[PDB]
Amino acid sequence: SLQTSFVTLDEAIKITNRRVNAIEHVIIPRIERTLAYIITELDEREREEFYRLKKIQEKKKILKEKSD
Amino acid sequence: VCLFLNLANDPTIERIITPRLALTTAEFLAYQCEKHVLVILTDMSSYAEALREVSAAREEVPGRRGFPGYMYTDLATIYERAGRVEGRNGSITQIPILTMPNDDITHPIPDLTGYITEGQIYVDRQLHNRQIYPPINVLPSLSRLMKSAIGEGMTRKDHADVSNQLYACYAIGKDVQAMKAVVGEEALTSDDLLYLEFLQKFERNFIAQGPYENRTVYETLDIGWQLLRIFPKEMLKRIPQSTLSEFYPR
Amino acid sequence: NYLSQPRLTYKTVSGVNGPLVILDHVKFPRYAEIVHLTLPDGTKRSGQVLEVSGSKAVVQVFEGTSGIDAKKTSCEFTGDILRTPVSEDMLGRVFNGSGKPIDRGPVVLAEDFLDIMGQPINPQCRIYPEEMIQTGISAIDGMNSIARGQKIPIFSAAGLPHNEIAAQICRQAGLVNFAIVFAAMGVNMETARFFKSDFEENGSMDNVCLFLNLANDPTIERIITPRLALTTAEFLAYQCEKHVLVILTDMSSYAEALREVSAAREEVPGRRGFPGYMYTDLATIYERAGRVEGRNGSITQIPILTMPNDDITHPIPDLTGYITEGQIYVDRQLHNRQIYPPINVLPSLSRLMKSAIGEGMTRKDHADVSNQLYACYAIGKDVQAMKAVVGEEALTSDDLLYLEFLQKFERNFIAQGPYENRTVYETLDIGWQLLRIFPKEMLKRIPQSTLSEFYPR
Amino acid sequence: STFGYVHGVSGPVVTACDMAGAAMYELVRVGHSELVGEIIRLEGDMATIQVYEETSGVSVGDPVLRTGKPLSVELGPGIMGAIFDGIQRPLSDISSQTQSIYIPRGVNVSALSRDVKWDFTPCKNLRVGSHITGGDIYGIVNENSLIKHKIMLPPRNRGTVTYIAPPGNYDTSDVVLELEFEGIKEKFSMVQVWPVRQVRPVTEKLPANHPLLTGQRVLDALFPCVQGGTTAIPGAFGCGKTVISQSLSKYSNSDVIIYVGCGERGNEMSEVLRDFPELTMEVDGKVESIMKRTALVANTSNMPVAAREASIYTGITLSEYFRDMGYHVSMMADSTSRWAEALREISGRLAEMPADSGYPAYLGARLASFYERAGRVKCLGNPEREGSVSIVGAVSPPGGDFSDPVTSATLGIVQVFWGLDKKLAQRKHFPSVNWLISYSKYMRALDEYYDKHFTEFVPLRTKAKEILQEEEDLAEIDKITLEVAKLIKDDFLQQNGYTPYDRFCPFYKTVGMLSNMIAFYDMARRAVETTWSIIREHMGEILYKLSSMKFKDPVKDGEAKIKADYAQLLEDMQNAF
Amino acid sequence: PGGDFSDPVTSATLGIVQVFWGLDKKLAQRKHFPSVNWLISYSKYMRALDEYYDKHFTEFVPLRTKAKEILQEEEDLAEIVQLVGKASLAETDKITLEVAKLIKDDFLQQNGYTPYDRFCPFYKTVGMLSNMIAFYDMARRAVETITWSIIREHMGEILYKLSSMKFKDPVKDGEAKIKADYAQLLEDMQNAF
Amino acid sequence: RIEIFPSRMAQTIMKARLKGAQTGRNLLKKKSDALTLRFRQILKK
């Protein structure tokens, strides 16, 4: 009753320790280096609107001094 | 030696005209006096932060990550001063050095120089942690002029073909360590135990020459063919049978 | 020591651009010189000058430029900056944002007028906080206790009971004077009706000086509300010798009122919309705290703020983590389980908790029973996750005992009722009642001296 | 022109007109309350000035009084023990002169006291008519019992002596020297004014060779730092940041210590001004206060943000001035991450382009132009003296991650990184410096000192590091190595700072303890290569001789070496048995 | 459908509004009508209502404080069963897992195109909440000693009566209240077993 | 390997995907550890 209990646990500990090592080394470092890509792609648009808005801030002054 | 030093306390606009004067000096020792010059530009990364800073002061057209829009051109006018010309015996060859930030090859500093140079040489950080001497990894490091500089006229006709195979045993074996992290060290088969067996012996024997030892291309291949002789036959699929017949029995 | 020159009355408006009115022909105009408008209807409106240049003076009004004209409006100036009237009669009074009363009393009768922008406190005459405030919520003052001069926010979410526990902190606070300045920035009507009727209607209105700014109210008044909060709270702490506790609710609603004024003078935004100088404007109102060496007064800040979408990387709960001194973490998963104060013990630490407790302060075993109650809760958490993964009975004989303590830690200790006051001595009595379980030499953190005294009873 | 008028204030900025002779980055005095401003743009006749203080109540027409000097400090006597802000106003004197608790927002109090008199002595063969160049030691002022504040010449000027002062007592405004040049007989007092953005001129830089004995066993042996070197440490709440900041000020071989609190907190800055006025240092005579060789740049986050950027530059100019007298200065910057959040406000007010994660384009260039101001260097001047400046800069990353535009920029310039761990501070492993991530690029330059002195040290460290390197893989899954590495981590690397001896050890004991723990190891490597369980049971007394070696009190100096001999030969016996 | 709490029209709304009925898209993919998910939604109006509740509906407030408990205690267990599999993990927590499925499909679901469910009154609403929580206190004490694997189809005539209470006419005034009294006492006989 | 489009609302989605996969490992770690402890003492028996 323990000999047939011994080998059925080593078939269920191996197909569990792979799913630990599939999450730890494949699923999470795919999500982690995706989340590092959303951060920089947010940043490359947050400095893109800083160039368009500062262009209007200079063009609101040149149009002002043309009136003055 | 024509050392052009520009330390970190020096002004940041002087770093613009420093690799300009280093090349037009070398475009006078070659192309006008016909001697073979080797240009080395330290910190080509640190040139580009001195190019980003001066362009943000000009308030113009930011590209990727704050670097300016013409950052491809101003890294090309100081890289394309190389090569040989017809009516001169001289030559000028560039080995620039650039520190890619945060180990990313998709950062614009290794990116735009990857498009304009004629190759790259990658220095790995995981191999530096194992005290491998030139801590270089060979997978993202390609030389574009490898196909012309090798041959029966130049160097030892098996050299051009064995480098196609030594990438294949390297690239397959690198996925084996990626597989060994998941399933286990015992679930590997007899094929992909040799791919780990080569990969452990490849780093310490084909690389790490030591800081004062130079070995020629004939010594490189005769220490490089030994690493393919821990492999069996018929798995060296990049090598044709006309060339494999000589160098394998030794 | 005063000004007696008569106030000029300009009728020379030269344009209206949204919230702000640009004047002309003004002679020597100051910065932040307050200006009283007069519409052609007859309605008075206040206004603060935001920009002068040569002869012009771009004054923004408080209550909007709706209905303002270009020919009949008389801008009459006021030769000095905005100065609040401050006295020791504001305790038990209710004002609005700008300072007029709300509680149907009279205008205040100041002993002096203080500049609401204040002056920065000297680092050299600043002294360390050591004594404890006894704020009553046993989840707060039991483990993560508050020192006397420690700024410590409450990181809530958008919907959790933060305002319903920012009133409990206000009522049941301190022991041996303890006036309390409440500042409600950008609340609802039903929250403002709650703050006026919970506080007002107990007997805390002998020391609580509440003033509150609705969402209806002008958004320029939401900037001068923490300025009016601390400049009376540092009159009561650094000019009278009281121990003030300042509660700045809806902080995240303060920075949204900073974004509107910064984009009113046509600035560019900063990181994630909030302007670049927000780390100064937060530090101007967070660092008007601590206690001094010349006097025995003190001022303590608990800024309640709601981080949006449970993001601590947001610039409001991130820039306050560099100025303040440790967080208190209201959790949503505890709130849906319907224990009333949702204070999570694991991600919430008090930075000056070590200095704030002790035998001279509250009790000898308070430094050790707080180290054990958090530690037994940590081993209590993964045991509950272990119950679902193997079974409720076959796991371990150890985890039979940690799992019943978590049911007693959640319901009996940190589920303090809506009106239940609880002193620091009443807290640790529940702290040892839960440590009646786990018999001796299981509690490894408590030393043998204080364990032998309090555990047998 | 002498004055300028305001002509408009729009926030921090003031566009002062009628300033035709105004240079860039000059300091001005805006308003009747005399707020300190900085000239930042120059449009012809007008000059856009950003003002450091709150510009509330500044009217159009207030006098802007220009000074003609850039952002500069006052260098001279009266600087030891003082507490400054970022722009060098004395916080201790500003509380007694005004009798308040707030900074009065307009006080131009002099940085050095113009009432305390100092005993000046001349250079004694510095005659009248002798030629003197910049950097020459001109006199000596006994500022304390510890610091001989050598009066120097400013590096700009030059000439021949015409009027010198007799030895006596003088003020900081009394003329001490008068120099003949070709044009003008120029006179100047004991106080020199030097801009902080301009590097102090010097003769020639030297390679740094003499290691900073900071006191701990793990730091001075395994991850050493040299005087004239740069060093970064992490900046969490509790790992070891109070220890390494104050043990390096108490027990190191540095002549002065200049601490820069760069926009820290409110009460974390108050505890530094509560602890540093009452620390004590054991000189060869009787003990003395640490405030006779310490200068503090205290700065909260409530203060102006141009006095938070300039707090680093002020603290390094005080550090580079005391370098030129021949002393061995060490500077503790705490922190630099709160300095990087001060540059983002300064460049954010000018609406410049945010390059990498908010921070401006010159974050990597301002840090590299500050860590390069360190180094052992032969100073200017004819007495031919040598000095050094060591910069220790705390890095406070968000969340403790080492991938950040200021953390990755700092660890590319520094050479020593004493990685302090919170996890080692949770388990009370004090000091909590990690040994896996930490390193030193300062090992190749120190073996000359470890061969001219202390010869048997470099085979030990290059072996004992591999013992800690082999132990981490073995703990993942040789049995001799796991026991001895436990002994090094519990006796050698662990160090209690409150024990009357173990608060500070010299290097001869530190090379002594690692000698025995390695001589026990290779003998036990041999003794198994001929039984390990009998080794653990029969040698239990000599393992007590190893684990109790740390208690060699400083009443035992030669005996501490003598006990190291006798505990060595006792290991020679039992290895054969 | 998107930008849940990070949208400047929604982020400015939540600072002003007191009640927020978040319509979820995960429930609308399975066509759960209404698609209000019960976790991110809230009501600041729970203190202002119990003065009205303890006059008219004195039973309701002790039901709702446990009606929100069951819907969250199933929520963490649904993250358990998805990974480790349904070994049912308990018996005292299995009854919470199916009395929640009684709630999420009979109580919470409401098809508005019928002539009965298009408007439910409060006595029909507090009636269904009193009956489906009386099954929860009685089957809690039943496992203080039997197992729900026996109970599920032994009480299958009662579990059909609890699932069929939502079909009554909105014009049955006393008759729905007797039906509330009828179906509750029939559970009292089964727990007396 | 990148999965979806960046730069709004996928960060909050991926932070939900990460947090589930972070404790999903730790839940499965305790399962694999209690299974090994059941396997270790059944070896001695």
What does this structure look like?
The PDB classes it as proton transport. Keywords: proton transport. Cryo-EM structure of V-ATPase from bovine brain, state 2. Chains A, F: V-type proton ATPase subunit D. Organism of A, F: Bos taurus. This is part of a larger assembly, with 2 copies of chain A, 2 copies of chain B and 2 copies of chain D. Chain A has helices at residues 3-6, 14-46, 49-67. Chain A has 68 residues and is mainly α. The radius of gyration of chain A is 29 Å and the shape is rod-shaped. With 250 residues, chain B is mainly alpha-helical. Chain D is of the alpha+beta class and 577 residues long. Chain D has 4 domains: 1-71, no CATH class; 72-115 and 189-440, no CATH class; 116-188, no CATH class; 441-577, no CATH class. In chain D, the strands form 6 sheets. In chain D, strands 8, 18, 19, 20, 23, 24, 25, 26, 27 and 28 form a 10-stranded mixed beta sheet that branches. Chain D has a 6-stranded antiparallel beta sheet with strand order 1-6-3-4-5-2, with no helix packed on it. In chain D, a hairpin with a 4-residue loop joins strand 3 and strand 4. Classes of the chains: A mainly alpha (68), B mainly alpha (250), D alpha+beta (577). Chains in contact: A-B, A-C, A-D, A-F, B-D, C-D, C-E, C-F, E-F. Chains C and D meet through strand 6, strand 12 and helix 7 of C and helix 4 and helix 7 of D.
Helix-strand blueprint:
This is part of a larger assembly, with two copies of chain A, two copies of chain B and two copies of chain D.
Chain A: H1 3-6, H2 14-46, H3 49-67
Chain B: H1 18-29, E1 36-39, H2 44-58, E2 91-94, H3 108-116, H4 159-180, H5 191-205, H6 217-228, H7 241-247
Parallel strand pairs in B: 1-2
Helix pairs in contact in B: 4-5
Chain D: E1 3-5, E2 13-16, E3 26-30, E4 35-43, E5 46-51, E6 63-70, E7 72-75, E8 83-84, H1 93-98, E9 118-122, E10 131-132, E11 137-142, E12 148-152, E13 159-163, E14 168-170, E15 177-180, E16 185-188, E17 192-195, E18 204-205, H2 217-221, E19 230-234, H3 241-250, E20 256-261, H4 267-270, H5 272-275, E21 280-281, E22 288-289, E23 294-297, H6 306-323, E24 328-334, H7 337-349, H8 363-368, E25 377-378, E26 386-395, H9 407-410, E27 416-417, H10 422-426, E28 439-440, H11 449-452, H12 458-476, H13 479-492, H14 507-528, H15 532-538, H16 540-547, H17 558-574
Parallel strand pairs in D: 8-23, 19-26, 19-27, 20-23, 20-24, 24-26
Antiparallel strand pairs in D: 1-6, 2-5, 3-4, 3-6, 4-5, 7-17, 9-11, 9-14, 10-13, 11-12, 13-15, 15-16, 18-25, 21-22, 25-26, 27-28
Helix pairs in contact in D: 6-7, 13-14, 14-17
